[PDB]
Design an enzyme around this catalytic site. Structure first.
Site, PDB file in Angstrom:
ATOM      1  N   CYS B 114     -33.975  -8.079 -33.978  1.00  0.00           N
ATOM      2  CA  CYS B 114     -34.141  -9.195 -34.903  1.00  0.00           C
ATOM      3  C   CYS B 114     -34.096 -10.542 -34.187  1.00  0.00           C
ATOM      4  CB  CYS B 114     -33.059  -9.172 -35.986  1.00  0.00           C
ATOM      5  SG  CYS B 114     -33.243 -10.463 -37.231  1.00  0.00           S
ATOM      6  N   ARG B 117     -31.343 -13.589 -35.877  1.00  0.00           N
ATOM      7  CA  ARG B 117     -29.901 -13.379 -35.968  1.00  0.00           C
ATOM      8  C   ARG B 117     -29.049 -14.640 -35.864  1.00  0.00           C
ATOM      9  NH1 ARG B 117     -28.821  -9.049 -31.563  1.00  0.00           N
ATOM     10  NH2 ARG B 117     -30.935  -9.573 -30.788  1.00  0.00           N
ATOM     11  N   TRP B 286     -36.077 -14.299 -44.828  1.00  0.00           N
ATOM     12  CA  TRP B 286     -37.349 -14.991 -45.015  1.00  0.00           C
ATOM     13  C   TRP B 286     -38.264 -14.639 -43.837  1.00  0.00           C
ATOM     14  CZ3 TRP B 286     -32.680 -17.775 -44.540  1.00  0.00           C
ATOM     15  CH2 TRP B 286     -32.422 -18.323 -43.275  1.00  0.00           C
ATOM     16  N   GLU B 291     -45.419 -12.396 -39.118  1.00  0.00           N
ATOM     17  CA  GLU B 291     -45.206 -11.125 -39.797  1.00  0.00           C
ATOM     18  C   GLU B 291     -46.226 -10.901 -40.901  1.00  0.00           C
ATOM     19  OE1 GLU B 291     -40.838  -9.748 -40.170  1.00  0.00           O
ATOM     20  OE2 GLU B 291     -40.730 -11.948 -40.388  1.00  0.00           O
TER      21      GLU B 291
HETATM   22  C1  HEM Z   1     -33.112 -14.691 -41.957  1.00  0.00           C
HETATM   23  C2  HEM Z   1     -34.402 -14.587 -41.610  1.00  0.00           C
HETATM   24  C3  HEM Z   1     -34.879 -13.402 -40.750  1.00  0.00           C
HETATM   25  C4  HEM Z   1     -35.916 -13.477 -39.936  1.00  0.00           C
HETATM   26  C5  HEM Z   1     -36.781 -14.743 -39.719  1.00  0.00           C
HETATM   27  C6  HEM Z   1     -36.067 -12.189 -39.300  1.00  0.00           C
HETATM   28  C7  HEM Z   1     -37.042 -11.883 -38.391  1.00  0.00           C
HETATM   29  C8  HEM Z   1     -37.279 -10.609 -37.948  1.00  0.00           C
HETATM   30  C9  HEM Z   1     -38.490 -10.150 -37.291  1.00  0.00           C
HETATM   31  C10 HEM Z   1     -39.728 -11.027 -36.977  1.00  0.00           C
HETATM   32  C11 HEM Z   1     -38.326  -8.858 -37.006  1.00  0.00           C
HETATM   33  C12 HEM Z   1     -39.369  -7.965 -36.298  1.00  0.00           C
HETATM   34  C13 HEM Z   1     -40.504  -7.676 -37.279  1.00  0.00           C
HETATM   35  C14 HEM Z   1     -41.620  -6.925 -36.607  1.00  0.00           C
HETATM   36  O1  HEM Z   1     -41.695  -6.908 -35.354  1.00  0.00           O
HETATM   37  O2  HEM Z   1     -42.450  -6.335 -37.336  1.00  0.00           O
HETATM   38  C15 HEM Z   1     -37.011  -8.446 -37.475  1.00  0.00           C
HETATM   39  C16 HEM Z   1     -36.442  -7.197 -37.374  1.00  0.00           C
HETATM   40  C17 HEM Z   1     -35.244  -6.824 -37.957  1.00  0.00           C
HETATM   41  N1  HEM Z   1     -34.401  -7.612 -38.745  1.00  0.00           N
HETATM   42 FE1  HEM Z   1     -34.546  -9.551 -38.917  1.00  0.00          FE
HETATM   43  N2  HEM Z   1     -35.086 -11.322 -39.758  1.00  0.00           N
HETATM   44  C18 HEM Z   1     -34.336 -12.059 -40.683  1.00  0.00           C
HETATM   45  C19 HEM Z   1     -33.260 -11.607 -41.413  1.00  0.00           C
HETATM   46  C20 HEM Z   1     -32.646 -10.384 -41.310  1.00  0.00           C
HETATM   47  C21 HEM Z   1     -31.506  -9.889 -42.086  1.00  0.00           C
HETATM   48  C22 HEM Z   1     -30.828 -10.731 -43.178  1.00  0.00           C
HETATM   49  C23 HEM Z   1     -31.235  -8.636 -41.667  1.00  0.00           C
HETATM   50  C24 HEM Z   1     -30.145  -7.629 -42.056  1.00  0.00           C
HETATM   51  C25 HEM Z   1     -29.007  -8.010 -42.668  1.00  0.00           C
HETATM   52  C26 HEM Z   1     -32.187  -8.325 -40.619  1.00  0.00           C
HETATM   53  C27 HEM Z   1     -32.257  -7.160 -39.889  1.00  0.00           C
HETATM   54  C28 HEM Z   1     -33.325  -6.810 -39.088  1.00  0.00           C
HETATM   55  C29 HEM Z   1     -33.495  -5.507 -38.477  1.00  0.00           C
HETATM   56  C30 HEM Z   1     -32.497  -4.324 -38.637  1.00  0.00           C
HETATM   57  C31 HEM Z   1     -34.642  -5.518 -37.800  1.00  0.00           C
HETATM   58  C32 HEM Z   1     -35.249  -4.365 -36.962  1.00  0.00           C
HETATM   59  C33 HEM Z   1     -35.864  -3.288 -37.858  1.00  0.00           C
HETATM   60  C34 HEM Z   1     -36.320  -2.117 -37.014  1.00  0.00           C
HETATM   61  O3  HEM Z   1     -35.741  -1.864 -35.923  1.00  0.00           O
HETATM   62  O4  HEM Z   1     -37.264  -1.417 -37.453  1.00  0.00           O
HETATM   63  N3  HEM Z   1     -33.014  -9.401 -40.453  1.00  0.00           N
HETATM   64  N4  HEM Z   1     -36.409  -9.544 -38.048  1.00  0.00           N
HETATM   65  C1  LIG Z   2     -34.689  -8.774 -43.086  1.00  0.00           C
HETATM   66  C2  LIG Z   2     -36.029  -8.971 -42.436  1.00  0.00           C
HETATM   67  C3  LIG Z   2     -36.625 -10.220 -42.471  1.00  0.00           C
HETATM   68  C4  LIG Z   2     -37.860 -10.403 -41.891  1.00  0.00           C
HETATM   69  N1  LIG Z   2     -38.453 -11.627 -41.956  1.00  0.00           N
HETATM   70  N2  LIG Z   2     -38.463  -9.363 -41.257  1.00  0.00           N
HETATM   71  C5  LIG Z   2     -37.892  -8.140 -41.184  1.00  0.00           C
HETATM   72  C6  LIG Z   2     -38.546  -7.097 -40.537  1.00  0.00           C
HETATM   73  C7  LIG Z   2     -37.943  -5.851 -40.446  1.00  0.00           C
HETATM   74  C8  LIG Z   2     -38.659  -4.708 -39.821  1.00  0.00           C
HETATM   75  C9  LIG Z   2     -39.694  -4.841 -38.908  1.00  0.00           C
HETATM   76  C10 LIG Z   2     -40.336  -3.701 -38.424  1.00  0.00           C
HETATM   77  C11 LIG Z   2     -39.979  -2.433 -38.878  1.00  0.00           C
HETATM   78  O1  LIG Z   2     -40.600  -1.294 -38.425  1.00  0.00           O
HETATM   79  C12 LIG Z   2     -41.796  -1.318 -37.639  1.00  0.00           C
HETATM   80  C13 LIG Z   2     -42.997  -1.840 -38.395  1.00  0.00           C
HETATM   81  C14 LIG Z   2     -43.739  -1.147 -39.342  1.00  0.00           C
HETATM   82  O2  LIG Z   2     -44.740  -1.996 -39.770  1.00  0.00           O
HETATM   83  C15 LIG Z   2     -44.598  -3.186 -39.084  1.00  0.00           C
HETATM   84  N3  LIG Z   2     -43.538  -3.072 -38.253  1.00  0.00           N
HETATM   85  C16 LIG Z   2     -38.970  -2.307 -39.813  1.00  0.00           C
HETATM   86  C17 LIG Z   2     -38.568  -0.934 -40.325  1.00  0.00           C
HETATM   87  N4  LIG Z   2     -38.944  -0.777 -41.744  1.00  0.00           N
HETATM   88  C18 LIG Z   2     -38.336  -3.443 -40.292  1.00  0.00           C
HETATM   89  C19 LIG Z   2     -36.708  -5.634 -41.048  1.00  0.00           C
HETATM   90  C20 LIG Z   2     -36.057  -6.673 -41.707  1.00  0.00           C
HETATM   91  C21 LIG Z   2     -36.657  -7.922 -41.779  1.00  0.00           C
END
Ligand code: HEM
Ligand SMILES: Cc1cc(N)nc2cc(-c3ccc(OCc4cocn4)c(CN)c3)ccc12
Ligand code: HEM
Ligand SMILES: Cc1cc(N)nc2cc(-c3ccc(OCc4cocn4)c(CN)c3)ccc12
Ligand SMILES: Cc1cc(N)nc2cc(-c3ccc(OCc4cocn4)c(CN)c3)ccc12
Ligand SMILES: Cc1cc(N)nc2cc(-c3ccc(OCc4cocn4)c(CN)c3)ccc12
Ligand SMILES: [Zn+2]
Lengths: 413, 416
Positions: B114, B117, B286, B291
């Site tokens: 993420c 964070r 958000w 994305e």
């Molecule tokens: C507050 C604004 C946030 C932004 C701008 C943000 C941004 C992102 C982005 C850009 C990704 C990667 C998406 C991708 O590559 O497709 C990501 C992944 C992730 N975010 Fe954040 N996020 C936010 C909030 C949060 C919150 C509130 C949580 C959990 C409490 C969270 C947990 C995660 C997790 C667990 C992943 C990885 C998912 C995976 O491994 O498949 N995020 N986030």
């Molecule tokens: C809270 C939050 C905010 C945000 N602004 N963004 C997020 C993006 C993910 C995320 C990104 C990629 C993932 O998995 C690979 C993928 C599939 O399709 C595109 N990426 C997954 C697993 N569901 C979650 C998870 C949480 C997010």
């Protein structure tokens, strides 16, 4: 155990068996991944370490030519054991030298250009004894590789390391680079990436023309002696003025770049032997050309200046003004090289070629080591086919390795 | 391993020392002879036993009481003894409200992929462990949506349904996100709507949903409580805030008819705290602009949004080296940021996000001893090298509490 890599765009799944044949470490552990560290953690080997590594390389060589266990192979093994025995080292046959150098390129996990791996012109410079001879060998390399713009992959291999006090080194990081000058006010004339080496050259006697695109002299070290300065004949340095197909003011930025990327500060390892001077060259992927970090004036970058001439809103980042000016600079680079019929490849065609290369390598070799962090282009990543390609990274030998900069190791005299 | 690990920023030359990696808990997938950092994923009855649960609970309780500067206190030793007795006589234990809140914030703090964070400690935790039915999950999820959306001034939040017990009574949100658009595979091979969601759309239809068969049909919620068969619910459309995509310079860009929803709300992940498994824990923040996945929509037959935008920009599309794809992708991403900002919906561009993450990562190394980060995911899908994270070395390792992947529920669910 076998390992699968999936492409998430095409759902194609490849099975990697080749990783079971590696034994150089990657730097990761079961608990920490270091895949984004650039160099993840004395160099003279004894006979004891040498023969295993030599035997391994002779074995895969005679296996490459479908003669594992032949009379030739059995004999070559005995020949190398005797020679390590009496001389603490050994010499590669010409065929081995060519095979080993092609395979260092094939094993370069960070190189997206490897579909060409076996079309490599190998120049054997192991008879070299002086820096003047290095300069002669390197001018021939440059002239051959450049080929009036129809670029051709090449490598020139100088004598191998012996005791470590007699290394051959090319002190330049590339055969052709531009000088960078730290300025009075503080900024940078020329290429900022080369300011340290430029001061080393001036300290060594180079008289700097103090322009923007001053080709740097070759600084060459033979048999561990002090390095000597040499000017590449300017007629051998092929250059491309950078212009834009739509923006007629782009040429007014005064920019140009050189045609031949020729990396000269890495170490070639084959069968336990270390070639500390082995400049190798191919042709550019458009995104490599680092002209964007030049200073147009005393304050503004090539990014800042281009976006200024594009009249973009640079007040906030969300206008993506950096992103637009980046694409246009790269359009200009590819347009200019193509207009001069100088070989270049765009990052779309390059990554497409690499996927096709991966398919080939999994078919005929059971795998292909690949460093996603480096394979994915530095712009527009996810719209290239490598972005969604899972990759397995592992370290095979023969290989190209990093080595210290010679000005940190060398005892002058 | 050794005690200290250094990472280098090659743009600024700042070096950071990591000691937090010594608290890493589970395997990465890598070994000393292979790196799996680009692999995406390196029986339902199988739950943690008493012997497995004890040390995991203890580790978490210790880490919690350490964080509140009460380590070794009477209250720490009593909490330990209470957990040990719950586990002994019920094979599980219940978190205190304080511990649940701390657990959830740190799963986010520990999410190595993420970029967002820097906000981790500002997360609204909704406790839904009293929920018993899918109608009540719907209630909790509607209030999460309404709170997190906040008329466009989005607030991050998570809602946490009862933890797993015997694996036969799981709560699950079957949706991958609370709000996603339907995709319909056509008899001719084309796709209407969002092709990323074709499979789940077909499940919803098979479960009794009547689709409008449009470009942007908000999917229904598919909610499983206590291991029962899931049930369908419509989100009230007034709760789904949406943004039409228009372009500051290109008048024709609105004529593409694109829109996207404001609230990214991931709902198929598993939250692990102290060895307890919360299989339903939708969380939201958000969007970063890059994305928003509108570029994969089909404008017509064989022309997606990339191709259509380049067509309306009158770019030469006959050769890749004109970089028409690159140019069109920038303009799409400009329009997406312009639209969310014009409608005052929270969004962050990739330049700002990565700059904030570098600032956050430096603070974490400073005050926490490290910050796990997955460069492969942290670096944005466009213009990577001109964002500050490209040149930043990172260490990736798995800390707990954590968000984890879980198999899709339709693969494992025993139908009643
Ligand atoms: C507050 C604004 C946030 C932004 C701008 C943000 C941004 C992102 C982005 C850009 C990704 C990667 C998406 C991708 O590559 O497709 C990501 C992944 C992730 N975010 Fe954040 N996020 C936010 C909030 C949060 C919150 C509130 C949580 C959990 C409490 C969270 C947990 C995660 C997790 C667990 C992943 C990885 C998912 C995976 O491994 O498949 N995020 N986030
Ligand atoms: C809270 C939050 C905010 C945000 N602004 N963004 C997020 C993006 C993910 C995320 C990104 C990629 C993932 O998995 C690979 C993928 C599939 O399709 C595109 N990426 C997954 C697993 N569901 C979650 C998870 C949480 C997010
Ligand atoms: C023929 C056209 C070639 C192209 C288009 C190409 C492209 C590239 C690119 C784009 C990189 C990454 C550059 C960066 O991110 O800064 C790279 C790395 C590399 N290339 Fe190739 N390359 C080519 C030929 C060669 C040849 C002929 C050799 C050696 C025989 C070679 C050896 C390497 C090595 C060793 C690396 C990794 C450097 C490291 O580990 O730090 N390449 N290549
Ligand atoms: C034959 C060849 C052709 C080409 N078209 N490209 C190349 C690029 C490299 C390369 C790239 C990055 C490297 O790492 C340090 C670095 C400095 O700046 C960015 N990376 C090194 C190590 N000398 C070599 C090496 C060889 C190349
Ligand atoms: C994680 C990573 C991935 C990748 N695929 N590549 C990278 C390239 C560099 C790197 C290091 C030094 C460099 O050189 C000095 C410098 C340039 O800009 C600021 N410092 C350059 C470019 N020259 C790149 C650093 C990290 C990289
Ligand atoms: C190595 C890697 C790095 C990264 N940083 N991210 C990635 C994202 C995906 C991925 C997987 C499934 C997806 O979903 C369906 C799909 C659309 O296009 C191709 N697959 C999407 C995008 N939605 C992305 C796959 C690999 C990724
Ligand atoms: Zn790794």
């Amino acid at each position: 155990r076998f390992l699968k890599v999936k492409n998430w765009e095409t759902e194609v799944v490849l099975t990697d068996t080749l990783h079971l044949k590696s034994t150089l470490e990657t730097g990761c552990t079961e608990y920490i991944c270091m895949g984004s560290i650039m160099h993840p953690s004395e160099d003279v080997a004894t006979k004891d370490q040498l023969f295993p590594l030599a035997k391994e390389f002779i074995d895969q060589y005679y296996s490459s030519i479908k003669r594992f266990g032949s009379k030739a192979h059995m004999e070559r093994l005995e020949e190398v054991n005797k020679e390590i025995d009496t001389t603490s080292t050994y010499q590669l046959k010409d065929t081995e030298l060519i095979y080993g150098a092609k395979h260092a390129w094939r094993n370069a996990s960070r190189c997206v250009g490897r579909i060409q791996w076996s079309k490599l012109q190998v120049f054997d410079a192991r008879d070299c004894t002086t820096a003047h001879g290095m300069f002669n060998y390197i001018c021939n390399h440059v002239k051959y590789a450049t080929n009036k713009g129809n670029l051709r992959s090449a490598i020139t291999i100088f004598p191998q390391r012996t005791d470590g006090k007699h290394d051959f080194r090319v002190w330049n990081s590339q055969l052709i680079r531009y000088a960078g000058y730290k300025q009075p006010d503080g900024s940078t004339l020329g290429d900022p990436a080369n300011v340290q080496f430029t001061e080393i050259c001036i300290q060594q006697g180079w008289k700097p023309p103090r322009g923007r695109f001053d080709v740097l002299p070759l600084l060459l070290q033979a048999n561990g002696n002090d390095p000597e300065l040499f000017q590449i004949p300017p007629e051998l340095v092929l250059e491309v003025p950078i212009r834009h197909p739509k923006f007629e003011w782009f040429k007014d930025l005064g920019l140009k770049w050189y045609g031949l990327p020729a990396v000269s500060n890495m170490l070639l390892e084959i069968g336990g032997l270390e070639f500390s001077a082995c400049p190798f060259s191919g042709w550019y992927m458009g995104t490599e050309i680092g002209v964007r970090d030049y200073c147009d004036n005393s304050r503004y970058n090539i990014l800042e200046e281009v976006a200024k001439k594009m009249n973009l809103d640079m007040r906030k980042t969300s206008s993506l003004w950096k992103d637009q000016a980046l694409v246009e600079i790269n359009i200009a680079v590819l347009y200019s090289f193509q207009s001069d019929k100088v070989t270049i490849v765009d990052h779309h065609s390059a990554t497409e070629s690499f996927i096709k290369h991966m398919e080939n390598e999994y078919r005929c070799r059971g795998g292909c080591p690949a460093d996603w962090v480096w394979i994915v282009p530095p712009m527009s990543g996810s719209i290239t086919p490598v972005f969604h390609q899972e990759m397995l990274n592992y370290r095979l030998t023969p290989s190209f390795e990093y080595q210290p900069d010679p000005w940190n190791t060398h005892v002058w005299k």
